[PDB]
Design a protein around this ligand. Structure first.
Ligand SMILES: Nc1ncnc2c1ncn2[C@@H]1O[C@H](COP(=O)(O)OP(=O)(O)O)[C@@H](O)[C@H]1O
Ligand SMILES: Nc1ncnc2c1ncn2[C@@H]1O[C@H](COP(=O)(O)OP(=O)(O)O)[C@@H](O)[C@H]1O
Lengths: 899, 899
């Protein structure tokens, strides 16, 4: 074996770690039996020396991930693993790293690197010979994202977050290999960050392995047989015993019950029940020579220790910390003996992070509603808020425990088992906290309804679940497993408060011959979820984002929405249309007179699909007033059918066909439908429809003959001034009812600006004009400003944003703002400014004659002097807002593009 | 609505049916509430008047399928449904149909058709106006398959099975519509038969509907509240109450418990537990003023009635039937009062088929091992065999019940509740019956391991399950759901008796980024199933038939097969090969020295996939002696690697590369590999490899230089006479070691027959030659016969099948058979014969000089005189077997095509 001092140092260090850290040391042959498959998988998956992947050790908490990583490193350091694949392996743990504030990868590695050896840069000469093991990533004080930039230099000092994110995204030592340990929650959290992923699942014990674990814990035989028989007779307990840590919990609980002499009782209704039984019986069997008052004081001090640790993302407790939280030497000895704490060096740690979270939740059970703030540990409202708001999701398990503790049954269990009283105001605290969150603005909060639903589900309190869920009106949820379907059905079964529902569902209804695959249980759960749609008589918006149905599930949803009791108003079905989908959605459209807005943005339709859609719309039970079909792959032939709808449904008044390819023959057919002075359509959006000036002829005949059409969007079309001139000739006559015109990015120039200037003088009805993103090069600007100076131009909103404007237009713009009394909004973003033009513009802006309410300008993108001038403008005209990105979101929403 | 007398007749019929059949008549508004979605879905899905679809009413037993179909027919006949879509709907029920033995569709329809109405041909004039409702298909005396042909004429008399299967496959009135009622078992049974399926699932009650049903059954309020509270406190009972029939069972059980006055106790461990509680409590509450002897005799008589009904597929009981089984008027009144039976006209029927199956299973509890045969009711051995043999699978639920009854706990429960003794030899009867079944030939007695596993699973007896499953050595199983995975894991956890395992697995491991999708539970179950492969030190053959894995499940399987304790010998992986499949399957190949046969037939490979396969095969831990790569999309370039294998692996001696496209350059490279007098390959099959005479040159150099190669298959290649003559030139020299040559379907003719005729005279080692399916005429046959008459021709097997042979060859054939003393097998199928040549052939065949053991000929395809002559031949030469399809299955198996 090659001489290596670092390898031997790690051998000694992890040999010592392997023998005293775990809850119970089992014979090594047993451990090797229990994890044989995973060890072999790892050893062969890394022998690759095209690229090397990052392998994630996947499993639930307490399954033994950290133990497996330590065994792997110990076997490598002894020379028994990766002998000819990795020369150096580094073991990084999250809690030890959290202490590091500002360090480079080299310094962190140097921490455990003996000087009497090779240098670190020399070992970095060959990066593929390095493996990084990252254990306890979920215990980090920061999140991992691509938000922060990622440097590629190991020598250069950086914050530890940047080092980890660079290592993970492979922008730092790309040749090295990564070994991650993640739970299901961590897997879902960091799936986006990880690429080229390879997974190894830990499986825990089998039934024979559970028997052997019991035989190893109980050094006798007959009581071991008794305990195994008792746990086997109960199904849920045996199922939970697959996890070695839960198995050890059950062992210690039963061992206390047996050494006490009591009969074998155990609670396995929930995981929280097993935790409560373990903690209860260890406390009773480990504290008997102590009076009740000091028992309560000691437990409360320990729980405060855990709560402070969890709120500061700390899991190692120096003696000074125990003294601060009121934990004395006697208390430390007692908890070490009863095996809720163990040493992790010179410091102490909880036997497992889950036990620490248990005590942290327990801490709130000693509290009063009118308690002074701890200034470190947040109160119940803060904990609930941080746990059900998606940004952090750090104190999740704690909150879950607290939810379960707040039930009357479990508060009773806790009080009876401990012997002292505990707070019963905690359910009310949680309820009021969730109500307060619900009454907040849904956009500013970003609720995580998966987290809230999990917490509610664990209480098994249907009335509590109904009360809490009915506080919320705008709900969004992802369903991709049966577990999440069960939880969502439980939480929404008795929900009658829905306003907006956003749903994404995958992996549940495959429709691979849905007859054989779908089950009555799945349909019943789905029907229960749908019951909220028809039971909530406040239901405005249903947004189905990339959902995957089969015929029965879709039929259930459509029949739910068809019921006359349903009050749906907006149906937003993104990217979904087939033959049976057509049939069922047409049942939806027909049956409901309350449904008025329909947005199919993105769903690629065919000729027959559009034919069937229009045939369903022509039914006289259809009250659709807004129809958005953007990016539906609609073409000219389908226009033949759409025109038909315009003839029949006098209730329809807004139609958007953006991002399609009408190609002037569809526009011809649509103008043929529109010309008839029976079509009641009031708003038309044909943005980016790949048509030209040829259609502007026919559209002109529309403008003369429609007394209902008031809004036209023709942006992103090649009009080349002939189309704009034809339309302007049509719009010269005041009898036209057009109010709003959008011709942005239409590839015209100054030449047609004269004709526009004519309509501005003759129209008494055109109030909003967007001519932005066109190269008017100050000639069009000068002509339009002179037109606006006319004492008959009733124009209210003008957009010339990003029009190749220069400081020469300023003066002429400055004179329009002070003369057009009806002009209240002007978009001039991306104009290039100097001092001599910014001064004139600001003089205009601060004037009483200037009747402008909204100015579109990008203040940040200028020098300091002009920034100071615009700030002075803001402080001298208290009615004017200067801002950029004025109309982007409004344009997207009205076109139907965003949603 | 059009006037119709048939409609009114069906209205009266189903109106009478609707009011007396059900267990409890609920208000009609309640029923319509409980089935609103399904009714609307049917009504709107059929209004479409393109092909006609088959609509299936899907749900578990007792969910209300028959009730829903009857209400649908009543509403149709009342004019409230399908008023403008169907003119005539026929309601076919299995039990009523079973009485018909041999009748046509017209007569069966006329059965319930009044004469004073329209004619049958006139109503068949427009088939589009016809709907068929098929209820109780699982209660048929015959099975439904596609084996029998399907005629399109309704007038022609046929057996009812043929009419029904033609109706289902739409080869009889294809324009008609179908409405089927099926269970999960029936759905999986008949999925193959049905096409264009449409499904409507019945959902049963919701929670509020369960409350309302309780309030409706219990006409008071306080016990309704008490019953609902008790059922709600128990999870399993509430879950089971979703089914209306199970809900009525629970209602009656609780009603007996309350009117008796006892506390509310109920066992809900299994569905069989609920049935036992219902039956026990109904019997106790309905026969208490009766002495024990007559209680037991009455229950036994009812059980006998049920048993005769189940074994004769009868479910309506005329009074003579009750008298024959010993059921009197007093007994009928008692059972009607306790609501185990109800009237269905002048006759009685069991309240539900499930109750009848329950009683039929109960009947065996009154029997003795040494009992005389009932001559109608089969004994326990016959019942178990018919239940776990796939051919019948009719009495499944009965057997399931009997299994649960046979446990000690449930026998104790039944004895305690009833009060009289019951048989305790039934576990032994079933175990011995299954042992005897296992010792039968696995090819004949078609076990249905899904049925056996379900029966074993329901007993919840791990020891009994292990004992029964270890009786079987050859197991084949399909896993397509999580339920079936759980069942197979439970049954195979402690199985260590495996010899051959055939597996087809779908729909469980999607590999849609298996990290997020796969769960530890599923992986654990799969590992438990795989544990049988490595725990059974007799494991010969593992056949994965079109299985679909992800990385973790495949890795679990491969690591299982890698263990040195594993004794795998034959690995048949049909239709699976990718890059990750490559890595893991190479772990399988490398690790195991016991593995010797490898068949990848059907798995589409690529250039690099074949490269990686060959590189894995070149490892020196590889003991493969047989390699089958038929229909693997292998081409000439991959031969370069394949040739390498032939050079390296001195253990390999059989290679089959059939159904590939080698195209003479691959064959060139392979012959370059074979020429080397180190290649130990002994048998090569290049059938259907798309090569020509150009390869026969190189193959010739093979036969001179390979002292180990003894079998060559070159069938179905365009070899013409030049290739065969080149090969014969190579094989003339006695130094060639070739023992078997297959040149069937090789497009040669009489011209090369001279050279073959030379080799037959000069070879001392060529024992089997197949020249079938080649257009050698009687001239070639005569030349070969003259060769065989030479006193040096040591040819043992000759195939001249399908060679355009005529009665002129007979004489020359007849004289070769009596001269070639070494010629023991000759295939002459498809030869045309007359009397004067058949006589010569038979005179040869019945002769002492004829040393033939096997003659390949199709006796059935000749006139009566020649048939009688060949029958006399068989009756005069007791050593000669005449048969057709002589070598087809052997050819397929040896090429690796079949399996
Ligand atoms: N295979 C095993 N055999 C015996 N004990 C185990 C095994 N796996 C885990 N344990 C015990 O369970 C605990 C698992 O905790 P840990 O190893 O931190 O897993 P995780 O990080 O997944 O929670 C350890 O304290 C160890 O004592
Ligand atoms: N929707 C329902 N509402 C109330 N009771 C029902 C309903 N469906 C079925 N039942 C009851 O359940 C029992 C079983 O009915 P059945 O239609 O025979 O089930 P299946 O057709 O599945 O065998 C009947 O006695 C009936 O009274």
């Amino acid at each position: 074996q090659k001489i290596n001092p670092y390898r031997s140092h790690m051998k000694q260090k992890f040999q010592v770690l392997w023998e005293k850290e775990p809850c119970l040391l089992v014979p090594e042959d047993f451990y090797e039996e229990t994890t044989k498959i995973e060890y072999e998988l790892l050893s062969t998956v890394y022998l690759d020396a095209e690229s090397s992947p990052t392998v994630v050790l996947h499993g639930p908490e307490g399954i033994g991930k950290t133990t497996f990583l330590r065994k792997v490193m110990l076997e490598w350091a002894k020379g028994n693993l990766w002998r000819d694949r990795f020369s150096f392996v580094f073991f990084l743990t999250g809690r030890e790293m959290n202490g590091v504030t500002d360090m480079s990868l080299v310094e962190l590695l140097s921490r455990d690197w003996p000087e009497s050896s090779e240098p670190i840069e020399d070992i970095f000469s060959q990066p593929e010979r390095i493996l990084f093991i990252l254990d306890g990533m979920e215990e980090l004080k920061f999140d991992l994202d691509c938000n922060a930039d990622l440097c590629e230099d190991w020598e250069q000092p950086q914050s530890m977050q940047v080092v980890l994110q660079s290592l993970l995204q492979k922008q730092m030592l790309p040749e090295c290999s990564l070994l991650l340990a993640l739970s299901k929650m961590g897997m879902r959290k960091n799936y986006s960050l990880l690429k080229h992923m390879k997974c190894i699942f830990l499986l825990g014990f089998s039934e024979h392995q559970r028997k052997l674990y019991f035989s190893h814990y109980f050094q006798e035989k007959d009581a071991s047989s008794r305990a195994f028989s008792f746990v086997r007779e109960k199904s849920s307990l045996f199922v939970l015993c697959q996890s070695p840590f839960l198995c050890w919990l059950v062992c210690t609980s039963l061992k206390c019950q047996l050494e006490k002499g009591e009969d074998l009782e155990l609670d396995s209704e929930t995981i929280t029940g097993l935790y409560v039984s373990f903690f209860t019986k260890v406390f009773r069997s480990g504290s008997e020579t102590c009076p009740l008052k000091q028992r309560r004081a000691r437990l409360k001090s320990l729980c405060t220790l855990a709560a402070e640790g969890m709120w500061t993302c700390t899991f190692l407790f120096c003696p000074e910390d125990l003294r601060r939280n009121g934990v004395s030497e006697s208390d430390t000895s007692m908890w070490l003996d009863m095996k809720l704490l163990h040493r992790s060096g010179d410091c102490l740690a909880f036997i497992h992070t889950c036990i620490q979270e248990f005590c942290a939740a327990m801490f709130y059970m000693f509290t009063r509603p009118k308690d002074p703030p701890h200034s470190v540990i947040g109160n119940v409202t803060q904990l609930i808020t941080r746990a059900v708001s998606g940004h952090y999701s750090r104190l999740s398990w704690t909150a879950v425990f607290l939810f379960v503790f707040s039930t009357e049954r479990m508060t009773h269990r806790l009080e009876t088992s401990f012997g002292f009283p505990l707070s019963k105001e905690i359910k009310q605290e949680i309820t009021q906290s969730l109500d307060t969150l619900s009454q907040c603005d849904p956009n500013n909060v970003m609720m995580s309804f998966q987290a809230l639903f999990n917490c509610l589900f664990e209480t098994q309190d249907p009335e509590f679940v109904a009360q809490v869920v009915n506080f919320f009106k705008d709900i969004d949820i992802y369903i991709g497993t049966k577990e999440e379907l069960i939880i969502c059905a439980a939480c929404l079964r008795h929900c009658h408060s829905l306003q907006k529902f956003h749903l994404c569902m995958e992996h549940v209804f495959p429709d691979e011959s849905g007859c054989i695959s779908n089950t009555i249980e799945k349909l019943t759960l789905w029907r229960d979820v749908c019951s909220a749609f028809a039971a909530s008589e406040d239901f405005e918006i249903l947004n189905l984002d990339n959902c995957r149905f089969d015929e029965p599930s879709l039929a259930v949803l459509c029949r739910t929405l068809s019921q006359p009791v349903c009050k749906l108003r907006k149906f937003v079905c993104n990217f979904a249309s087939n033959l049976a989908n057509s049939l069922e959605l047409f049942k939806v459209i027909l049956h409901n007179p309350h449904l008025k807005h329909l947005n199919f943005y993105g769903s690629s339709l065919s000729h027959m699909d559009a034919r069937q859609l229009c045939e369903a719309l022509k039914h006289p039970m259809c009250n659709i007033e807004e129809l958005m079909l953007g990016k539906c792959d609609i073409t000219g032939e389908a226009c033949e059918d759409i025109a038909s709808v315009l003839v029949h449904n006098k209730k329809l008044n807004l139609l958007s066909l953006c991002e399609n390819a009408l190609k002037d023959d569809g526009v011809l057919v649509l103008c043929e439908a529109l010309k008839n002075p029976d079509c009641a359509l009031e708003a038309l959006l044909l943005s980016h429809c790949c048509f030209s000036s040829a259609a502007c002829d026919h559209l002109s005949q529309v403008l003369l003959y429609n007394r209902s059409l008031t809004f036209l969007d023709l942006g992103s079309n090649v009009l080349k001034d002939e189309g704009v001139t034809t339309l302007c000739e049509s719009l010269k006559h005041p009898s036209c009812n057009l109010q709003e015109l959008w011709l942005m990015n239409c590839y015209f120039t100054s030449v047609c600006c004269v004709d526009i200037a004519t309509v501005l003088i003759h129209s008494e009805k055109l109030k909003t004009l967007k001519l932005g993103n066109n190269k008017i090069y100050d000639a069009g600007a000068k002509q339009l400003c002179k037109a606006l100076k006319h004492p008959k131009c009733k124009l209210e909103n003008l957009g010339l944003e990003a029009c190749e404007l220069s400081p020469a237009s300023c003066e002429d713009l400055a004179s329009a703002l002070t003369t057009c009394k009806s002009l209240t909004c002007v978009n001039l973003e991306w104009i290039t400014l100097d001092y001599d033009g910014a001064a004139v513009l600001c003089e205009a802006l601060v004037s009483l004659e200037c009747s402008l309410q909204l100015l579109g300008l990008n203040k940040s993108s200028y020098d300091e002097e002009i920034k100071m001038m615009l700030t002075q403008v803001e402080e001298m005209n208290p009615n004017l807002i200067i801002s950029h990105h004025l109309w982007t979101d409004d344009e997207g929403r009205r076109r139907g593009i965003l949603v």
